[PDB]
Amino acid sequence: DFEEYWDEPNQSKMVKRGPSNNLLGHDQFAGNTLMELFIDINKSAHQYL
């Protein structure tokens, strides 16, 4: 009799988004909207830089 149990804090969801191809970055849900981003130009999505 299968029932679904699971509990992942939304922080884990916000972490599993990983890097971002675009230069806007991923959202840190806090106060006035805040767009964070990490860049390593050697990678593929920012290689053109």
């Binding site: 939304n10 849900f29 806090a30 106060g31 006035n32």
Partner: protein, 48 residues
């Protein structure tokens, strides 16, 4: 979850705005209070 934001506005001045939510789940904040403050040294020669 209460979070205060401090925004530089002018020389000395600053802007303060607050927000709240539920911690483990909520991505939705709703501003509860706000105001402006200024970091100016006063004149304590009219005092007591």
């Amino acid at each position: 979850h209460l979070q205060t934001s401090i925004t530089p506005t002018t020389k000395g001045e600053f802007k303060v705005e607050f927000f709240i939510k539920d911690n483990r789940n909520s991505t939705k904040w709703t501003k509860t209070s706000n105001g402006r403050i200024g970091l100016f040294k006063h004149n304590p020669k009219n005092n007591k």
